[PDB]
Amino acid sequence: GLSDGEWQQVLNVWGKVEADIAGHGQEVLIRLFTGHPETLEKFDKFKHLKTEAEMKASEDLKKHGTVVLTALGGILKKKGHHEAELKPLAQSHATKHKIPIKYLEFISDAIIHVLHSKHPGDFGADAQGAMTKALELFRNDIAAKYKELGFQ
Numbered sequence: 001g002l003s004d005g006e007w008q009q010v011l012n013v014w015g016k017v018e019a020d021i022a023g024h025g026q027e028v029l030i031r032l033f034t035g036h037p038e039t040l041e042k043f044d045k046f047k048h049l050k051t052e053a054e055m056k057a058s059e060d061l062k063k064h065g066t067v068v069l070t071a072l073g074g075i076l077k078k079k080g081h082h083e084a085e086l087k088p089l090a091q092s093h094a095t096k097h098k099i100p101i102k103y104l105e106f107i108s109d110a111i112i113h114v115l116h117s118k119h120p121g122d123f124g125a126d127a128q129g130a131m132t133k134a135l136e137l138f139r140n141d142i143a144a145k146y147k148e149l150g151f152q
């Protein structure tokens, strides 16, 4: 549950991502895959990438980065009212992709890392606080649907 001030910060930060959605999406996925290689195993179409150079060179990875962040952005722009948007994602990731909630924690922190890396000194403490809360909310609502599905 975020305040309007905090949502304002979130969508302010998001404007950064939107100026270059493919570049951000790419770096988030790379940070995830290199920070936590077990996550790469959940992607049949990226599991071939063994080096970060190959990851960097992958137009299809950038493409998927775009899909992921486009979806996240759509969800964030709802300012918490994202049940319709989130439900199919929770369902596909629990039932088809089989993604444990731990990996959503991983990518949340990865987003935080990328924003500092791409915008050093331009991602203030208040901004980080708001973004972190927003990703926690997202994660928590997925976690609820996972529990419903009995998915571990």
Ligand code: HEM
Pocket: 039, 040, 042, 043, 044, 045, 067, 068, 069, 071, 072, 088, 089, 092, 093, 097, 099, 103, 104, 107
């Ligand atoms: C911010 C968090 C995430 C968002 C917004 C997101 C969104 C999406 C979307 C929109 C799709 C395509 C439609 C669908 O299959 O439902 C997708 C596919 C997929 N996601 Fe996620 N995702 C997130 C996190 C993750 C994480 C952390 C993993 C694994 C570590 C993951 C694994 C996958 C896989 C394996 C696919 C199918 C890829 C393919 O073969 O096309 N996702 N995701």
